[PDB]
Point group: C2
Amino acid sequence: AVGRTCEGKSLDLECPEGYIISVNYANYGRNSPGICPHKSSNAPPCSASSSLRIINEHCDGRSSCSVHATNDVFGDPCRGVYKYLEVDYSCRRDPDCQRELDCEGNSINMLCPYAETPAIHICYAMYGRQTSEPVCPSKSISTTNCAASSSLSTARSVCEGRSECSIAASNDVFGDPCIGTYKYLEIDYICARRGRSCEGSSLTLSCSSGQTISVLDAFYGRTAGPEICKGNAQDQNCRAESSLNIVQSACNGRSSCSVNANNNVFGDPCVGTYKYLEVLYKCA
Amino acid sequence: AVGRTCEGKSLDLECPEGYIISVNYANYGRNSPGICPHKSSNAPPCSASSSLRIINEHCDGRSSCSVHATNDVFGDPCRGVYKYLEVDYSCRRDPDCQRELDCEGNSINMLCPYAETPAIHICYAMYGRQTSEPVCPSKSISTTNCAASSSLSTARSVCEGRSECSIAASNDVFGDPCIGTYKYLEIDYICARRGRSCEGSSLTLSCSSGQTISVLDAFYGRTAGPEICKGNAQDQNCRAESSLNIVQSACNGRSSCSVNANNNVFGDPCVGTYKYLEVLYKCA
Ligand SMILES: C[C@@H]1O[C@@H](O)[C@H](O)[C@H](O)[C@H]1O
Ligand SMILES: C[C@@H]1O[C@@H](O)[C@H](O)[C@H](O)[C@H]1O
Ligand SMILES: C[C@@H]1O[C@@H](O)[C@H](O)[C@H](O)[C@H]1O
Ligand SMILES: C[C@@H]1O[C@@H](O)[C@H](O)[C@H](O)[C@H]1O
Ligand SMILES: C[C@@H]1O[C@@H](O)[C@H](O)[C@H](O)[C@H]1O
Ligand SMILES: C[C@@H]1O[C@@H](O)[C@H](O)[C@H](O)[C@H]1O
């Protein structure tokens, strides 16, 4: 996939649910007259050498990113030349995740037994059918373009952040996305590090050994009762929009970050509930 | 994208024209009961550690590959267990290629000035329109799903193997794939190494410095007159089918290879024409 934006505007990259961005090429500069055309003469090819690393920091491993195509971000690789940002990227399932699959009627049991990586993160999920043989054969199949649009959200609502989760490949969980067709559940998961701080405090994330953070899930709000961050727990469906983007933007590609769990960073998604910041991440 | 095949069968991976295979995950083994099911009890997860490297050798950088899912290829990572091969891959434009673009009416001029890398290889080509602003703006646009299906074949027929090529973004070259819409030409190209041997001789390809071969184009046959491999030149539209696959299969992922230019390797694609083997490749 290719995205292009002119200097001064922002470029949005996105992948479908359960896929992340994998950057192949990036440049801020100019290598064609026909993109963001101005006048007049052709100049020598222009490329900011900084471009790839910056786009990797801003976008790799995320489902979504927005990058400003400006000299402040990239430097100016050719003064007096109207520039543009071009990215070539692929949307892939994260190869750091473990790949599981069971046919309809079975359950997938995930377990994160280690203390340092105790939290399940669901990377990808599909309840339905995307292929025929040799997956879960049955006489009762009429489609290979079947998926609950809810697959990842439901999987995450069941399992995200838990140390153990058993999830049924069943219509009672996901709904039935293709009546009449024998289905399967395909889930990719990772055992993540977890950080949590109560509202009013800071949260520090850390990777050792010259390793770097990739934030996988984050919310400022509350999804649990008062056994987590004792305080008023009236809204347990509370999540600041853009929590993940903010924490990814603060932390991805670094060895340490600190983020304040507070309303001045995330807004207040649930007035009168005592909130916390909970983050799942990996170190690579 | 995901491909799966049971032990004893072959797995075919393919990308559309101008895209190559980029492998994300591979395993020969068993990690699910529901894929290539047999009986009965679940065993511990089974993975050949060899799998990724082998699939990379067989498939990375190619538009197509076919791999036998067998113990001879991978070893046997779990005796007595019916296995399967699963690959997760992405199809991408080769980032080793230079990215060019000009609007309809202009020409793209490619040049390979160095002796050691004197041959143009066209990696990707699209004459048409795949996006709106900020590419080649015009009032006369009614589609962004327009491409000459001939784009890459025509580009290669014009330029492949030359040290200089100037190709017009024009209907007279590619045909008109979207009448009424102002078009552009997007070409990615690389300056390749070239090897050539006349039929009856061998051809050796070589990368220095612990670098490895990736074959980009190959034909056994003839496309030039008798100034190349003097001999009968009656068929100059002569190419053995599967030349590229054979040379990729002999050479990709190695530091040196030798291939005999002869009918016992490639068949005879043009009886009574004196043939040669011509290969473009890169070292990475
Ligand atoms: C044309 C203009 O020239 C200078 O102001 C800067 O180089 C800026 O990035 C460019 O867009
Ligand atoms: C084959 C069978 O048919 C319908 O009953 C349901 O869609 C069910 O989920 C499926 O497994
Ligand atoms: C309990 C308390 O209630 C209000 O002051 C705010 O919503 C604050 O964020 C919360 O912590
Ligand atoms: C079931 C059969 O068992 C042995 O013969 C081998 O391990 C073979 O790979 C497996 O498929
Ligand atoms: C806008 C214009 O319209 C038609 O004449 C042709 O399709 C031509 O290629 C295009 O550039
Ligand atoms: C000229 C000669 O003609 C026949 O013997 C074969 O086609 C051979 O391949 C070719 O080299």
